[PDB]
Amino acid sequence: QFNEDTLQQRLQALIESAGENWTYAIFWQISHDFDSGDNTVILGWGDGYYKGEAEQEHRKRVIRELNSLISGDEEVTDTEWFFLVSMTQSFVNGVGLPGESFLNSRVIWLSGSGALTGSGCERAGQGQIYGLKTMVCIATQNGVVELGSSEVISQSSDLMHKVNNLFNFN
Amino acid sequence: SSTSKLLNKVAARASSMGTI
């Protein structure tokens, strides 16, 4: 039904449409791996959209930020840092937050700091450190869509409707 | 604002971009 170009623009619509303070959306895509020796399903960054809401740390941060702008000032917050750092992460299927979602076709809704730090998932604990309080992973056939917010958000039926209209499902 | 548009710039290409 859907495809990679349509991938990003739908993540946009989901974050904008919802009446909740969602900070970003990410789509983790499937890949296959071998070694010299089996076939492993891999989750990786297919795309993402950020909406939003120490001078050692900050000068370091703006410096990569200016380094990616030349490739193709302001202050850069924790949520923004977490969003772009996430582009380098990958998840073996059934491992971590996005992997566990995909193996069992599961939607994991983590609401509250305690739910994040008690989830046993690395990515959930890392998101909490950068101020996230809600993190969601909804397993699609196309992949896994991840939502995250600095606010505490309960699972809305209106949101699960929008997610279902913007991604592939078996 | 400014940083947000750059994030979405890198995001839409980060699939092909291997070294971020």
Curated annotation (Swiss-Prot), chain A:
Annotated knockout phenotype: Minor effect on jasmonic acid response and no effect on glucosinolate biosynthesis. Myc2 and myc3 double mutant has an increased insensitivity to jasmonic acid. Myc2, myc3 and myc4 triple mutant has no jasmonate-related defense response, is devoid of glucosinolates and is extremely susceptible to generalist herbivores.
Subcellular localization(s) per the UniProt record: Nucleus
Effect upon mutating D47 to A/Q/S: Exhibits an atr2D-like phenotype; dominant resistance to 5-methyl-tryptophan (5MT), a toxic tryptophan analog
GO cellular component, one term: nucleus
Any one biological process term the GO annotation gives: defense response
Record comment regarding domains: The JAZ-interaction domain (JID) (82-141) is sufficient for interaction with MYB proteins and most of the TIFY/JAZ proteins.
Function: Transcription factor involved in tryptophan, jasmonic acid (JA) and other stress-responsive gene regulation. With MYC2 and MYC4, controls additively subsets of JA-dependent responses. Can form complexes with all known glucosinolate-related MYBs to regulate glucosinolate biosynthesis. Binds to the G-box (5'-CACGTG-3') of promoters. Activates multiple TIFY/JAZ promoters.
Protein name listed in UniProt: Transcription factor MYC3
Encoding gene per record: MYC3
UniProtKB/Swiss-Prot annotation, chain B:
Disruption phenotype: Low levels of aliphatic glucosinolates.
Name of the protein in its database record: Transcription factor MYB29
Biological role stated in the UniProt entry: Plays a minor rheostat role in aliphatic glucosinolates (GLSs) biosynthesis, mostly short chained. Together with MYB28/HAG1 and MYB76/HAG2, promotes aliphatic glucosinolate biosynthesis but represses indolic glucosinolate biosynthesis. Prevents insect performance (e.g. lepidopteran insect Mamestra brassicae) by promoting glucosinolates.
Gene name per UniProt: MYB29
Subcellular location: Nucleus
Superkingdom of origin: Eukaryota
Subunit structure: Can form complexes with MYC2, MYC3 or MYC4.
Expression across tissues: Expressed in both vegetative and generative organs. Mostly present in seedlings, inflorescences, roots and stems, and, to a lower extent, in leaves (in midvein and trichomes) and siliques.
Induction or repression: Slightly induced by gibberellic acid (GA), jasmonic acid (JA, MeJA), nitrogen starvation and UV LIGHT treatment. Transiently repressed by salicylic acid (SA). Accumulates upon mechanical stimuli (e.g. wounding) in inflorescence. Down-regulated by sulfur-deficient stress.
